Design a protein around this ligand. Structure first.
Ligand code: FES
Ligand SMILES: [Mg+2]
Lengths: 135, 100, 44, 215, 57, 14, 26, 49, 225
């Protein structure tokens, strides 16, 4: 004797109720573990609905201040002929090296954007970095 | 002083790469089926590239290669569909082999 | 969709029109309603 | 052994077949229950009526609902729901009121263990819609303990037979709120004209409140 | 269900809950209210909820 | 309680 | 709170919309 | 007919890790053959029917 | 007389501790991040019930919040360890054929069960007919992939709930977690993610089985003397 109404409550609620009603003579092996360490959400069937009108998902695009510097760097100098190595968790691309220098010079008090971008390229050229302008 | 997830995500190479279109990345061949090379490049999905005609025998399991990325995940929504169809693979062009 | 029906449930299935698939197919299986469509459109 | 089975509908279904013409099969609807809140229903289909009975009753015992009962005799609150085109309006009632409901609801209520309830069925009177519509409404009723936990307040029952004595029926297990529930001068709840027309003495029916056998 | 918002207003029980029974002197009561404005909100609810009770009594 | 014809005889099994 | 959290802004990598060969010409 | 003895002990635990496939012997064979094909890669007619 | 002490010293004692098996030492947000567990599908594939567990979208690619994954993974690993400790039958289910071989080996090594093959109608809801009237069903089903190969929920998710079997499941951003008892938001595609999951569950299960033997043995030695 039991219940296969998987869309009515949860396996816990259905099992708990039938144990109270005496329908289940013994509790299942998992019941005491679920009770002691329950999930964050009780697993209850729900029907996913489609959004209409002015309803929008709450997920937000992930952006950072440095993304503005990256967009300009890719436009001006393009993607570096050096290849990304996404297996190394500490990999630094020419763009990231550019962003770090750009951040340092901003903290030194410079506030202009067009001037803070030209001085950064010079610093890297002095350090031996290859910056071939796309156009 | 335990690093947070927000910190890992900000400073990850995949985050720093920005858009993937026309980005050169280093991949690794992990599976081969005839002349189909399955290449992992650090993303969610592998890409599948045909063995190049020149120096085809140089491409073996473990061989590191240079790729030009086009899409991290090939997906499209077709008429009358509530969600997107995904082929569960990245789109990339195999350029050659990476050597030191 | 349009008056032309597009309800097929396995719409995300990756179409595999190859000579090898035909051999590895249930003999009972018969062409579905929207199975001809891909053939009519692939031939085009 | 603790479960009883009741038939709700026996139908003769006629299927037109390519070579054999009109064939006759049986569709049965049965309800099961132990009288202590555990009850279910199932459809049975077989060529022979007795086989359709065995299929339905054996299947129903594997699709049991648990139905919460107030004081093990009535529902916790008035339930008004629509399932497809069948409307069911149920009223919580005191002891001794009996089951004044559609005969099928009476049968199901005895299997669940409800002794006192009023119900009115409107719209389509489809036995299957009524059965599954009834079980849907009885399985989604909020108990007094759930109400106390949801609002973190005491649930206090006032009975006219007990005068002004406040009877706490449920208290929240978690902390107890300190802010009274807001007193909206006028509630924006939707009312049933049938209920209001009766309370105002404007409901005239020769068929209402007729003397009937104990149910 | 009963038509309109707050159908409770169209019940004899609600209308009999008015506590304002005017003295015999009162012959006419005019209500001047504004449909919009935060400072005239009580007057709108007075027209909406209580004028029926006043007239009933 | 009531009597319904039984499904089958247990000897009539694999 | 936390400095490394994402910040709200408009897509910096967004590409310009396409234009026809005669866009901007009389 | 050599129907395999009960495929679980007294505690009810099946003996084979692929029991719940219903075809444990067939899938145990496919698993062993698929595994051999993997190891070869890591390392690298008339007579019978 | 002696049974109540057994169930109290062995079966009820683990349930009085928040982490009886120390499964929090098995993983970290960094270890999850290195396995690419945070990488989800494109935003167009997102399931709306997975939105709570999503950190955001990075250029139309959803990112799974590993702070939640770590909390959900802790619960799932904790439940799995307790069920292995209680000698429950654990069944791993996945239809992703890239990992069928890996998952079958992990199940065999931990002493549990795997079903990575085509799932036939009624394995769970009609098991007595398929296996026999005395067949024991799984006490816990772990989905390493909750979707079948046509991108629909694996039928066993619904059928496990019908048979009142708790489910642990890796749920990617295009998956539906409503009926999964202990869902773990995480990447289900990348080999590094899948390999990590198999190590964690394999270790959690193997540790809980060894803990059960340690406690039993101690309870017997002390019983004689
Ligand atoms: S794109 Fe045609 S006028 Fe601008
Ligand atoms: Mg996935």
């Amino acid at each position: 004797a039991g219940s296969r109404l998987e869309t009515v409550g949860s396996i816990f609620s259905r099992t708990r109720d039938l144990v109270r009603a005496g329908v289940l003579k013994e509790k299942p092996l998992w019941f005491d573990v679920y009770d002691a360490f329950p999930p964050l959400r009780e697993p209850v069937f729900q029907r996913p609905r489609v959004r209409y009108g002015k309803a929008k998902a709450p997920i937000q695009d992930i952006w950072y201040h440095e993304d503005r510097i990256r967009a300009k760097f890719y436009s001006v100098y393009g993607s570096g002929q050096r290849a990304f190595d996404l297996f190394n968790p500490n990999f630094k691309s020419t763009c990231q090296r550019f962003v770090e220098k750009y951040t340092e010079l901003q903290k030194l008090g410079e506030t202009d954007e067009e001037k803070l971008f030209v001085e950064t390229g010079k610093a890297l050229l002095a350090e031996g970095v290859i910056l071939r302008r796309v156009g | 002083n335990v690093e947070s997830f927000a910190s890992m995500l900000r400073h990850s190479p995949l985050t720093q790469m920005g858009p993937a279109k026309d980005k050169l990345v280093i991949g690794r061949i992990f599976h081969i089926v005839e002349n189909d090379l399955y290449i992992d490049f650090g993303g969610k999905f592998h890409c599948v590239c045909r063995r190049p005609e020149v120096d085809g025998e140089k491409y073996q399991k473990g061989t590191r290669v240079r790729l030009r990325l086009l899409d991290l995940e090939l997906t499209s929504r077709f008429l009358g569909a509530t969600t997107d169809t995904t082929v569960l693979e990245a789109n990339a062009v195999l350029l050659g082999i990476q050597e030191s | 969709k349009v008056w032309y029906e597009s309800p097929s449930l396995g719409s995300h299935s990756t179409y595999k029109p190859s000579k090898l698939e035909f051999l590895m197919r249930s003999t009972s299986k018969k062409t579905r309603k929207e199975d001809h469509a891909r053939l009519r459109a692939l031939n085009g | 052994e603790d479960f009883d089975t009741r038939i709700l509908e026996v139908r003769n279904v006629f299927t037109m077949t390519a070579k054999e013409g009109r064939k006759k099969s049986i569709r049965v609807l049965v309800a099961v229950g132990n009288g202590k809140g555990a009850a279910g229903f199932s459809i049975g289909k077989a060529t022979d009526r007795m086989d359709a009975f065995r299929k339905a009753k054996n299947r129903a015992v594997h699709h049991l609902h648990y139905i919460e009962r107030y004081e093990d005799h009535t529902i916790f609150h008035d339930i008004s729901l629509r399932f497809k085109r069948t409307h069911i309006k149920m009223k919580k009632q005191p002891k001794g009121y009996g089951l004044r409901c559609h005969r099928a609801i009476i049968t199901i209520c005895r299997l669940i263990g409800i002794k006192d309830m009023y119900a009115k069925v409107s719209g389509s009177i489809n036995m299957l819609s009524l059965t599954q519509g009834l079980f849907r409404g009885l399985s989604r009723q909020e108990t007094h303990q759930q109400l106390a936990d949801k609002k973190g307040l005491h649930v206090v029952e006032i009975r006219e037979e007990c005068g002004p004595l406040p009877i706490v029926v449920a208290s929240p297990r978690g902390p107890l709120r300190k802010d009274p529930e807001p007193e909206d001068e006028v509630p924006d709840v939707k009312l049933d004209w049938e209920d209001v027309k009766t309370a105002q003495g404007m409901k005239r029916s020769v068929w209402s409140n007729l003397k009937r056998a104990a149910t | 269900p009963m038509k309109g918002r707050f159908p409770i207003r169209r019940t004899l029980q609600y209308l009999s809950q008015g506590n304002v029974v005017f003295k015999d002197s009162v012959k006419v009561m005019t209500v001047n209210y504004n449909t919009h404005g935060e400072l005239g909100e009580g007057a709108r609810k007075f027209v909406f909820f209580n004028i029926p009770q006043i007239q009933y009594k | 309680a009531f009597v319904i014809p039984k499904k089958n005889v247990p000897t009539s099994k694999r | 709170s936390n400095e490394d959290l994402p910040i709200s802004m408009e897509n910096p990598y967004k590409e310009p919309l396409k234009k026809c060969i005669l866009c901007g010409k009389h | 007919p050599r129907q395999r003895a009960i495929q679980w002990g007294e505690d009810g635990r099946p003996f084979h890790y692929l029991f719940y496939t219903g075809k444990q012997s067939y899938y145990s064979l496919m698993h062993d053959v698929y595994g051999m094909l993997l190891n070869l890669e890591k390392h690298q007619v008339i007579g019978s029917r | 007389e002696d049974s109540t002490d057994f169930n109290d010293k062995i079966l009820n004692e683990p349930l009085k501790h928040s982490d009886f098996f120390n499964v929090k030492e098995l993983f970290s947000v960094r270890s999850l991040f290195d396995a690419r567990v945070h990488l989800g599908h494109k935003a167009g594939c997102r399931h709306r019930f997975m939105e709570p567990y999503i950190f955001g979208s990075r250029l139309d690619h959803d990112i799974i919040d590993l702070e939640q994954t770590a909390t959900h993974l802790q619960l799932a690993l904790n439940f799995t360890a307790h069920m292995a400790y209680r000698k429950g039958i654990i069944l791993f289910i996945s239809r992703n054929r890239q990992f069928s071989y890996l998952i079958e080996n992990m199940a065999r090594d931990c002493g549990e069960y795997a079903h990575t093959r085509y799932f036939r109608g009624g394995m769970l809801t009609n098991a007595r007919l398929l296996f026999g009237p005395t067949v024991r069903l799984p006490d816990l089903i772990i989905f390493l992939h909750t979707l079948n190969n046509i991108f629909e929920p694996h039928v066993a998710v619904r059928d496990a709930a019908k048979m009142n079997i708790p489910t642990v499941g890796i749920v990617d951003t295009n998956c539906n977690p409503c009926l999964i008892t202990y869902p773990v938001p995480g990447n289900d595609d990348s080999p590094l993610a899948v390999h990590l999951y198999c190590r964690l569950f394999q270790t959690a299960i193997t540790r809980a089985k060894e803990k059960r033997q340690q406690v039993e043995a101690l309870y017997r030695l002390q019983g004689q003397k």
